[PDB]
Amino acid sequence: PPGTVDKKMVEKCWKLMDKVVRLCQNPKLALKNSPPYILDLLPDTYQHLRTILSRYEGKMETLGENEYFRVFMENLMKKTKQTISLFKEGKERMYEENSQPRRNLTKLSLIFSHMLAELKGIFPSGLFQGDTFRITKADAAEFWRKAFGEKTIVPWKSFRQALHEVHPISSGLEAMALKSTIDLTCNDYISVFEFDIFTRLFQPWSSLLRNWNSLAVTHPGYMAFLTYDEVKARLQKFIHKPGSYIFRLSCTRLGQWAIGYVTADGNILQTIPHNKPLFQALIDGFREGFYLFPDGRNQNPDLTGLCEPTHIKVTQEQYELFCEMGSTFQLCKICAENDKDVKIEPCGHLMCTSCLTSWQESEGQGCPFCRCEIKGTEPIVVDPFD
Ligand SMILES: [Ca+2]
Ligand SMILES: [Zn+2]
Ligand SMILES: [Zn+2]
């Protein structure tokens, strides 16, 4: 895997994508129009795929041999069947908002959003431009070329080992946490589009992982992907506390941050740092007295050490908590399909049985997360009532 793409497969994905549309059109659901919107993202993906097939009408063989497209269509079918099955098992819970199956539909919608953004970035106007994809940051670009050359997409394991040579990765828990941020399409593959977005968010390249640890992993202000209405909702509690701020990612504008803050008048405003790294904007904003309380907390981090040449560490408890951020606690964070049903001793990490088995059968060393020895295992129930 992944195998070549036949026209019979593309017709199969379309039959699947349509089934998801029919399910989400249900008035009993009453989805949110705010991005990501799956009822718009799917027909756009379909309409763009036709554009791709339109340009490769006379040259279909070369399209099926394209490594990126084989991966994309593989993930498209997997993420679509995952959504269809989500409606199947969830049953009545889908209708009640803020339910665990319903929340997973939001996570999947965000991934479908990331997929279309990647497809339009790699196939502009329906033509493959992957090998000539320009990585914005220079220092990040020369790294990719040295390690992967003209490759559009690479396996996570290959990407992890490569990045490890320049920016050290102390443990597998840091690796899994790193993957949760950079692997937008969630297909165990890293593309130039994904790599570009990440290296733009956590610039400079010289202190890449040292920036990501201090801005996302251990920073209360980090909110990942949120809607502006969701930013107003959380900051509304601290509307009587000028200086209260949070920063988020936007699915409609990848690669840049959006900082929400509380004024003295009692308003919630929102700015976008443009040409300076996030920590440089937070430091300056801290001196100005606008960015004072991350998530309303009186303990604001000192990021001034990032400008200096060199030097902080992160607990493994913080890495594990970061992995549980972008989704619900129910989901296994390895496959992001099945729910947890087994606990590993003595590290206490949770997962599903299929992943643990797949890791052991693949001659893996110990726990899939921390790679520590497995003394014993015990089963857990994640959905006790339903
Ligand atoms: Ca990916
Ligand atoms: Zn799993
Ligand atoms: Zn473990």
Numbering used by the authors: 47 to 356, 360 to 435
Sentences from the paper on this structure:
Casitas B-lineage lymphoma (Cbl or c-Cbl) is a RING ubiquitin ligase that negatively regulates protein tyrosine kinase (PTK) signalling. The conserved N-terminus of Cbl family proteins contains a substrate tyrosine kinase-binding domain (TKBD), a linker helix region (LHR) and a RING domain. The RING domain mediates the transfer of ubiquitin (Ub) from an E2 Ub-conjugating enzyme to the substrate. Phosphorylation of a conserved residue (Tyr371) on the linker helix region (LHR) between the substrate-binding and RING domains is required to ubiquitinate PTKs, thereby flagging them for degradation.
Tyr371 is on the LH, and, in the unphosphorylated state, Tyr371 and several other residues from the LH, including Tyr368, bind to the TKBD, limiting movement between the RING and TKBD to rotation about LL2. In the native state, Trp258, Ala262, Val263, and Met274 form a hydrophobic pocket around the aromatic ring of Tyr371 and the side chain of Ser227 forms a hydrogen bond with the hydroxyl group of Tyr371. We predict that, while a large aromatic residue like Phe cannot duplicate the Tyr371-TKBD interactions, neither will it perturb those interactions; hence, Cbl Y371F can adopt and readily maintain conformations observed in the unphosphorylated state. In contrast, when Tyr371 is substituted with Phe, the UbcH5B–Ub binding affinity is comparable to wild-type (N-Cbl Y371F, 84 μM) and the LHR-TKBD interaction is unperturbed, as demonstrated by the crystallographic structure of N-Cbl Y371F. When Tyr371 is mutated to Phe, the hydrophobic interactions are not disturbed and the native state is maintained: the UbcH5B–Ub binding affinity, Rg, Dmax and Rflex values are comparable to native Cbl. Notably, N-Cbl Y371F appears slightly more compact and less flexible than wild-type N-Cbl, with an Rg of 2.38 nm, a Dmax of 7.67 nm, and an Rflex of approximately 56 %. In addition, previous in vitro autoubiquitination assays show native Cbl and Cbl Y371F have comparable catalytic efficiencies. Thus, in solution, it appears as though Cbl Y371F mimics the behaviour of native Cbl. Cbl Y368F is slightly more flexible than native Cbl but retains the ability to ubiquitinate receptor PTKs, whereas Cbl Y371F cannot ubiquitinate receptor PTKs but is able to maintain the native conformation in solution. For Cbl Y371F, neither the number of foci nor the relative cell density are significantly different than in cells infected with wild-type Cbl; these results suggest this mutant may potentiate transformation but not to the same extent as the other Cbl Y371 mutants or Cbl70Z.
